[PDB]
Amino acid sequence: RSGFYRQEVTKTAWEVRAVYRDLQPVAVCSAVDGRTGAKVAIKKLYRPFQSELFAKRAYRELRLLKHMRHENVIGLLDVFTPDETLDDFTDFYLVMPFMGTDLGKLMKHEKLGEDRIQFLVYQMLKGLRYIHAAGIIHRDLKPGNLAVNEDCELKILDFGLARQADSEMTGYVVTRWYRAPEVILNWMRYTQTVDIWSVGCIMAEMITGKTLFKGSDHLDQLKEIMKVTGTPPAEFVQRLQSDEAKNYMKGLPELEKKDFASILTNASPLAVNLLEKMLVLDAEQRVTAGEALAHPYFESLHQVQKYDDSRTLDEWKRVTYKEVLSFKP
Numbered sequence: 001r002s003g004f005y006r007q008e009v010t011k012t013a014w015e016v017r018a019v020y021r022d023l024q025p026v027a028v029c030s031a032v033d034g035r036t037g038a039k040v041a042i043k044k045l046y047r048p049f050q051s052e053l054f055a056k057r058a059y060r061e062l063r064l065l066k067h068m069r070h071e072n073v074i075g076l077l078d079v080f081t082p083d084e085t086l087d088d089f090t091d092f093y094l095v096m097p098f099m100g101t102d103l104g105k106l107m108k109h110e111k112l113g114e115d116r117i118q119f120l121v122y123q124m125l126k127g128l129r130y131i132h133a134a135g136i137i138h139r140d141l142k143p144g145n146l147a148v149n150e151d152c153e154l155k156i157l158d159f160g161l162a163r164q165a166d167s168e169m170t171g172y173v174v175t176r177w178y179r180a181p182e183v184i185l186n187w188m189r190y191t192q193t194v195d196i197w198s199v200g201c202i203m204a205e206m207i208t209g210k211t212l213f214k215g216s217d218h219l220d221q222l223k224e225i226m227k228v229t230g231t232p233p234a235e236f237v238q239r240l241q242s243d244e245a246k247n248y249m250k251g252l253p254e255l256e257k258k259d260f261a262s263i264l265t266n267a268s269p270l271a272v273n274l275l276e277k278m279l280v281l282d283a284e285q286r287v288t289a290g291e292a293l294a295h296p297y298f299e300s301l302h303q304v305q306k307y308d309d310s311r312t313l314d315e316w317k318r319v320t321y322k323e324v325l326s327f328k329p
């Protein structure tokens, strides 16, 4: 086949290539490359040029995906747009290999198990070490953004909130239950370690089966975390730059740090130790992906090019359109 075609998926309308066949939702769709017979994943960027925040993310997602190359990080097979000219170029689609299902769904159906949980987390971390060594920050590691196939292979998904690590980044980032405390206590100045926090909540969730810190709102999330990691010293919270965070932590009781083994019922000793090292409140003492991998937990399993880069709604739209057409499979 050749050309394009349109279809009613859920509530949305897609205009994929004629070759990509039999679409199925999972917004992302699972199609089949008519040319080979291999299942594929097609992601439609939802109105990417509806704002500057949306455009910026769309371009960042395309760009990082086009750059990164790792066995544990999703890759592009094709990227296209059914818009023939820059003038009416409203959207574009990303094509990645179908990876089975996401960790979130996988956990809802079945309980994992020691060997499995280890293998999966090892992979999250190699993928992370790569993304980080490359100077990139993910900002959204959660079960739903981690794909796992039949052979238990994993690939980190969704770079929609990712970017190149810098000193002062955008504040409201990471999905709440996987959001590290400093995203709020240290508004706009968190680091790549936030992704280690997310990996800890994720690893913790795989073991227990329950969400580790299920908070009602961003501030309440702090309380949920604190109930486990204890609260920081009172003199520290006094000097907090963020008013919102300072007031909240002030009214909050004075909680003590609980032993992790007391929470993780049937978890292993080394697993508890690693988690303890990943979920430390102090971003600095918090283990890195490299260090994480080096841990005795990953015993039975034990260089990169930094990403580089350089606006109006039409500037993002144009800069993006260029990166779409310059794609080589």
Ligand SMILES: Nc1ncnc2c1ncn2[C@@H]1O[C@H](COP(=O)(O)OP(=O)(O)NP(=O)(O)O)[C@@H](O)[C@H]1O
Residues within 6 Å of the ligand: 026, 027, 028, 041, 043, 074, 096, 097, 098, 099, 100, 101, 102, 144, 145, 147, 157, 158, 159, 160
């Ligand atoms: N390559 C893939 N293979 C299999 N499933 C995939 C693949 N890419 C994405 N998915 C699925 O699509 C769902 C959402 O994908 P995602 O790339 O995170 O888009 P998103 O809509 O921006 N998600 P989010 O911002 O977290 O709400 C995932 O939970 C997976 O089921």
Ligand SMILES: [Mg+2]
Residues within 6 Å of the ligand: 144, 145, 158
């Ligand atoms: Mg997702």
Ligand SMILES: [Mg+2]
Residues within 6 Å of the ligand: 158, 159, 160, 161
């Ligand atoms: Mg996204």
